């Protein structure tokens, strides 16, 4: 059981009686007080004036805790000899001797306890439990260097073999250890204790008793070693079970229901931690990127404007046809970083060296495409700016711009977004405290650079460059072209979908070892859907393929999915563009994993066995060399 | 009670012992038990006919 | 996955009366993995 | 035990054959039926006409399931006061009352159950088990917002300390909560219930009983908290055990015997999910890149050619000296994406704007180097094409091509691949519907671009650009120059081995904290091999070194391997280039981890204690500020 | 219990007594000797379940004539009363009754028999899994139905030719019925159909019910989150005291730079000759083999200062560059790495005397090819490599200087007018650390680091110019794990308070109430909660914001410490729960998947009609 | 804990005598997760 012990304050006791139980304290059971403890460890002082007399609560100890703390004691007991040398814990802790067995009501709450009366319930006090744990911790703190040195001694030379047997003269092994052990090792100072400890740990190290002349296995972990050992024609149960466990954890994290839902799914639920993305605005195609706007290349009359910064200083910038801006709305909180390193921006009457470039934000009701005069800019503000420097490049008589890290954070909440007919635009170009003659500088902007965008939130998702509060995962399948995916924003739902499907891919690869054109339990779900679809009635010429061809097609599709996860969202993919196939695979993977029974592939098993035999041969050769170079008397 | 439905073929009495070819399964046991069972079931000692060697 | 029996058969694969009804409560399970940590096995 | 219960058919004391047993049903044990269920939860209807009366099967409940399902109710009992407030589950579930104990044969099959007669076996029906689980889930569904608000209340201010003890006026804390908790919080509606719940959960919060004037601890998780609490000069057992388990899991995933085999291993077994790669074909070198073919220069007579696409449209191409193609044989299924953004391709008699480029595939029997006339091309097909667009660049009076994405999936299965003399090539170049004058266009191809290469399978492995059926891991050590590694294919065995060895790297870094030139149990295996090697007699001059120098060299080698896992395959690596050293380390890691006993690094422990003390001091300072504000009455 | 059985050799027996105990062997249970070990109940149960796994397939094994008798692990144990322990000292205090013991030989034989059966059943298990996964046999929620005759027809049509199911139909049916309770076969003799599964208890944990997600998956998610927090170690990542570099550091990642475009005031590990020398000179350097080479040093040259950087590996790539002048042709030339050890600062070099020791450590040849541009050539890909190891280089002297340079080398003397390029540093450089026990802060190694001091002290330029083994990168990588942990835990939307966001609100309220330098304007609890939620969302979106200078609120280290500490409590105080939005979304999605499965099964039944009864 | 109220029958949140004293030994815990693997559950 678990919880705390209770006593009945009144004669009436029913499963729902009001106010009938009260906590059991140390006064009710005197032998749980600290004054009556078993001071074999010596923690409690023997002076009467140093022991307090106060009431303490009681808690119930469970069998899981009992067993695990006993195993913790055995952890300490593995190194008794060095403990005896250091004169620590002459008497074993024996957790069972700190518990008192009582018959009472047990439960977390009084209502539960009223229905649960048990006999021989172990109880303890927090102070005694702390004392026990403290003793164990003190001993473990003591055994630190001994543990390290023993591990070093074991790992200096091969002590375990994957399969089979190896042997070497023990005198030769001891001579090699004496030659190669460090100077400060405790093993040199205390050989006998190390020998006994290693005999306990490993069943392959056996010492002869000189009095009786007998050798014998002395290990204490045969049961665990049996499960850790590879049987003939089979890999270890530990390895198989652990691999299956990891695969199931991967699928659980991948969350098939969410990744295969046919119904709308909330954006905060669907979203996952994103990653930054890189772009070059100047080389983008506006027909493919929906978050860019550009002045048409027909206005043909550059005009000068003046803007002020937060500090209140004034700057001048020129706007001409072909200028590009980013539509700040509908893109969620974001962080922009611009780098101009490696570009030239050199003109006959313009020297970039020593000039300043900055980010400018515009707010206006007039759409950007109709801007022809300064009156139409609205409210403009310079957010950040940096000065530039030029250095010679590989090309002769060519000076390029040093690296830059211009940064800005778009946070929509800081802006006043109540008015629906308001537009937000972001611009990057040359700025100056003096008027810039349009003929001198003719570049529309400085967007020919490297732009890195990082999402500033993980609760919003975008599709095709616009935010959506709601997402349908299954309907994204086979709806993206490569250029659309390239031009997609960092927080696009496609990237999250790919990242989630990557876990499924890893789980399948862990579970599977099938070669080319071989059917698999993770590949037949697609085959079933194909078989049904080819019989389904529709429009077009019908082609009939047998089960062998269908299985080969399904295996190829599965291999393609494992090789590249983006194929599911890529448009016109051979087989993985069908939502039925995607859902069938997603559902089938979970059942395939759950129906396994401690199994491994035949190919994997035979390969593992061959590799283990090769390693055994290598170990035997090394031990032969050691014996040859350290002769026994 | 699951058994096949068939009748037993009738054969004559073979006058001499018949050669047998054993086949193995994946079951295993210890050597000591084999020796002990052989000792319990053996018919030795006995005096055979030596025959001719050349 | 055809079948054919002689005299009698306690089970008929292709007969009538069988039930195929997948459900969440029933599910389907085997022994995929067990806890065999060396320290806990001892 | 486990399985299902069996009973003797007909007469008893006659069970000698498996055919005499049959599965037990609720008809044999009437008190397992629905009508005899104790309906303390009210799930079963009280109307006699609504209670089914049918036979049901029986299953055996394991003690692990008993303990876990019993501990499940503790989650409900932690919040009984709000359950009473909502009038839900007035009586605790009490799982043990749902079981019936009988004596029978226990097993999964009759043959097994024949020899496994046991007494006092608990049995249950699926309906009753589902009822119990449904009740628990209903309560958990009910307690959702309450638990959320309770966690908010606990986390609004620090309620736990890593080490030590802190204090603050409860009245001031209550004032802060009243000032800061949200309006809609259930805590405002139900103060006393929240106080009781938090007193149950945390032992540092104690309420004084007004009538008796007593204050005492009522926490119910002292045993569990003792394991989490860090003792003096020792980290928690929880943290130590968890870290060791994670390291062992990483090594088990990393598969030391596979990554250290000396015999051929199947490609499907060895392979892991790959990653895309990037190349620039024009700037590669033919000697390093074995999958590239070039028309030799000085051929100096370009020739025109016509190729039809799948639809039937005809196109014109020009092939001159210096043109490169990709050998599509022995490279496994793969996908190529080409991008020409940022290039110029501008000549006096050729303007790229509006032109078209595409992928052309040639099948022929003549080697590509000997091509001099149109008759030597065999069959050709244009598989994809795209139109180009140009935009002005930073450089004055120059233009560059916008971002493009031309894709092609090479899968060998679709191609015939039936004749051993056939040669397959891939080429990207300008294509036009009209003939191109050789003087106007002078570029051999459009390969001066960015190529992204992605595998389409996970069962094939390539070595130096050619597919192999099996790979020997031990011979990949120290056999790759940087140029070869850079020019290698995305599905190379070297990348897979690097990824696998990475896991060993994080495992070693997790379980080790050694500084510069400090020996470790994970570094001594290399030292042993070095000592034996220097003792070995062989060709070349031998110089003897001390054990200290050997230990320092081994430690530096291990540190280098941890810093960069790719060094194991790099040619002429200092110490890691030896397969003996690699195998020794890989095998020794398992023993080093498995021989640990709840230990931790000394430097780690000291740092952890110091950091915990610092955090405790910070928490005390914060509480002092909180008490300075919100003054107590 | 646990350990080995012991026997007392004398009559004196106390908690501490010399001798008095010996191992218990095979002869004295009531020949060759073997020891004895104690078997734990955990092992007993696990091996019994291992037997059950085999026993799932009895009907097939009977046809194969394999494993006629079940293993029965419990029949191999002997029960004795004696002292039990790992050491005699523990055994003297631990006396037990009715403990099981076994011998290693019998244990090994039992495990070997189990493994042999497991190998024997491999093809059968694969075939069964294929049969189960061919068509949907499990639904996330609810129920579905389809005629068994139609299902059997579909499997008969689509199963592989070599499947053992075709050879053994009935055995497969029984095996499938023993694993899945949805497949039920009517008993002909009494005409009844009935569930025959043996895993109802296990299935009940996996089955969704009411309006809540499965208990096992909720627990698994919470366990994964706690594991991530443990692997993050908030105490170490939020200490306010110095922490050793070997403890703080983690496996790093390579970094990429372009030396020529970097700024000297941003990179403290670059040293440049002032451009006012305007007097190029010529020097000669001998390589390791002994070959002599020629190179020139002019104003504007840049070198790497190797004294403070930890063990590093440099890789240089020249691909795509021009380096072509009127009187110099890059094609056919050679480039290389030259290392100098001199006692004179690099900025003061004006003649060949000050160079000190020098060595060409590596070199490669260049090849050129035509580019996209007209009448212009570019150098092919280069992979020039070097490893800086400080241990070899004699570091005892405290006034030596170590510089690294890359430039054109040639066997013949190079005229300064022919080549006017200061160096070949205008290329791509990849740096990879070679030791995980060293950490750098803005270009120099430090033995101790204060993690809380790193918060809010980096500009973007500084972060870009930082070395690969910088402390900020390790801090970001460690904070990432808490980022995924919080994201797994929470599902909150915009401007919604969370248990993982409240501590920032508390710290903000306390700081606002605190009186100091500067005017104050009070803000309500709602605005404070909004700010805290936005801060948490920004942190999850980009973990690197914590080290960025002038971050909105995350530059304050108090908020970072409060969040790091509060995550632990928030995770530990959960009680088998999940978010409301998560639960409703899971329910709706499961219902949709159930509808899809029902539609598919209807299509199967339509295209494989069952025979129509005529009774 | 519990913001503001005025009842003062059994416990008084706003009264005197209560102690707020967090420490490592007491800590704070609930039921976060359980061992419910199918193989172990059987």
Residue numbers in the entry:
A (entry chain F), D (entry chain B): 43 to 675
B (entry chain J): 377 to 430
C (entry chain E), F (entry chain A): 1 to 42
E (entry chain H): 43 to 72, 95 to 679
Lines from the paper:
MRV is a prototypical member of the Reoviridae family of segmented double-stranded RNA (dsRNA) viruses, which is further divided into two subfamilies based on the presence or absence of turrets on the inner capsids: turreted (Spinareovirinae, including MRV) and nonturreted (Sedoreovirinae, including bluetongue virus (BTV) and the life-threatening rotavirus). MRV capsids are composed of two concentric protein layers, encapsulating 10 dsRNA segments. The outer layer of MRV consists of the protection protein σ3, membrane penetration protein μ1, and spike protein σ1. The inner layer consists of proteins λ1, σ2, and turret protein λ223.
The transcription enzyme complex (TEC) is comprised of λ3 and μ2 and is attached inside the inner layer. Asymmetric sub-particle reconstruction yielded near-atomic resolution (up to 3.0 Å) structures for five types of viral particles, all with visible side chain densities for atomic model building: from 6 h post-infection, core, virion, empty core, and empty virion were reconstructed; and for 48 h post-infection, structures of virion, empty virion, and outer shell particle were obtained. Inside the particle, reconstructions of virion and core particles clearly show that the layered RNA genome and densities of TEC (at red arrows) are underneath the inner shell, indicating that genome replication from ssRNA to dsRNA has been completed in the core. However, an asymmetric reconstruction of the TEC was obtained after focused classification in virions only, not in the empty virion. This result suggests that the RNA genome is important for stable docking of TEC to the inner layer protein shell, though it is not required for TEC incorporation into the capsid, as also suggested by the tomograms. The λ2 pentameric turret changes conformation during virus assembly: in the core, the turret is open, with a central channel 75 Å in diameter; in the virion, it closes, sealing off the channel. As the proteins μ1/σ3 coat the core to form the outer layer of the virion, the last two of the three Ig-like domains, acting as a rigid body, flip down 46° to close the channel, which is then sealed by σ1 attachment. Studies have shown that assembled core particles in the condensates are active in mRNA transcription, but this activity is inhibited after outer layer proteins μ1/σ3 and σ1 are incorporated to form virion particles. Our structural data align with these functional findings: in the core, the open conformation of the turret maximally facilitates mRNA export efficiency, while in the virion, the closed conformation of the turret suppresses transcription, leading to a virion in the quiescent state. The coating of outer layer proteins μ1, σ3, and σ1 occurs continuously throughout capsid formation and completes the virion particles, which eventually egress from the cell.
